[PDB]
Each structure stands twice: as C-alpha cells, then as structure tokens.
C-alpha cells in the first residue's frame, strides 16, 4: 500500500524533502497541494477519491490553516521541479540481492517491473 518509491532506493542520500506527505516513501510523480506539501500522484488521487480532505501533514506540523490546508483537485498541481530533482537522485534497486544501479528516473523507466529478483523465481 506504498505507492511511493522504497526509501531503499536512495540509501544514505535519503532526505525528508523527498518524501511523500502520505505514504512517507520517496515521491513518485509528485503533486504539490495549495499548502505546499507534496504527495505522490497516486497517493493524492486516493486521498481525494471522496472529495477534499484536510492536509494531515499541515495538522501534524502544526501549521494547518483553513482553506489553504485543504487538499483539493482544483488547487493541487504537478510539482515538476520536485519531480526533476527526485529523478536525478542516485538509486539502487530495493530488491534485496539486486545489483542494478542508476538514477531514480532510470529506475522508474528501465528497471522497475523488470527486476530479476522479482521475475525470475529460481534466482
Ligand atoms: Zn505517496
Ligand atoms: Zn499541508
Ligand atoms: Zn532489481
């Protein structure tokens, strides 16, 4: 139930600003809500499946503000600056035993869903 990328991908380079406000994993196709908090596209869509919702991150961080801290489709946008930054980070496959290495973007487009440890049962 974790849409975001396993924190294992970044390893020691793991940073808080690269994490989804919802699943707490590395941002996957990030959107930025009106309040500034980032969410994986999948995570935000799920949260907003039944309409607007209060931003849990705003609450927990004690900065909740009426109106601005409300997650809404009309005020959330693709955070391409965040996406580009995260895609440029050095990454290693999360599969315990895999040696694949490259940028997170290369992981998403070339390795994810094509991992030997996951697809080859006799590995
Ligand atoms: Zn997420
Ligand atoms: Zn927020
Ligand atoms: Zn792998």
UniProtKB/Swiss-Prot annotation:
This is TNF receptor-associated factor 2. A zinc finger (RING-type) spans 20-59. It comes from Homo sapiens (Human). Homotrimer. Heterotrimer with TRAF1. Heterotrimer with TRAF3 (via TRAF domain). The domain containing the RING-type and the first TRAF-type zinc finger can also form homodimers (in vitro). Interacts with TNFRSF1B/TNFR2. Interacts with TNFRSF5/CD40. Interacts with TNFRSF4, TNFRSF7/CD27, TNFRSF8/CD30, TNFRSF9/CD137, TNFRSF11A/RANK, TNFRSF13B/TACI, TNFRSF14, TNFRSF16/NGFR, TNFRSF17/BCMA, TNFRSF18/AITR, TNFRSF19/TROY, TNFRSF19L/RELT and EDAR. Stimulation of TNF-alpha receptor TNFRSF1A leads to the formation of two distinct signaling complexes. Phosphorylated at several serine residues within the first 128 amino acid residues. Phosphorylated at Thr-103 in response to signaling via TNF and TNFRSF1A. Phosphorylation at Thr-103 is required for 'Lys-63'-linked polyubiquitination, but not for 'Lys-48'-linked polyubiquitination. Phosphorylation at Thr-103 is important for interaction with IKKA and IKKB, activation of IKK and subsequent activation of NF-kappa-B. Undergoes both 'Lys-48'-linked and 'Lys-63'-linked polyubiquitination. Polyubiquitinated via 'Lys-63'-linked ubiquitin in response to TNF signaling; this requires prior phosphorylation at Thr-103. 'Lys-63'-linked polyubiquitination promotes TRAF2-mediated activation of NF-kappa-B. Can be polyubiquitinated at several Lys residues via 'Lys-48'-linked ubiquitin chains in response to TNF signaling, leading to proteasomal degradation. Autoubiquitinated, leading to its subsequent proteasomal degradation. Polyubiquitinated by BIRC2 and SIAH2, leading to its subsequent proteasomal degradation. There is a cross-link at residue 17 (Glycyl lysine isopeptide (Lys-Gly) (interchain with G-Cter in ubiquitin)). The modification Phosphothreonine is found at residues 8, 103. Belongs to the TNF receptor-associated factor family. A subfamily. The coiled coil domain mediates homo- and hetero-oligomerization. The MATH/TRAF domain binds to receptor cytoplasmic domains. E3 ubiquitin-protein ligase that regulates activation of NF-kappa-B and JNK and plays a central role in the regulation of cell survival and apoptosis. Catalyzes 'Lys-63'-linked ubiquitination of target proteins, such as BIRC3, IKBKE, MLST8, RIPK1 and TICAM1. Is an essential constituent of several E3 ubiquitin-protein ligase complexes, where it promotes the ubiquitination of target proteins by bringing them into contact with other E3 ubiquitin ligases. It is found in: Cytoplasm. It comes from the Eukaryota.
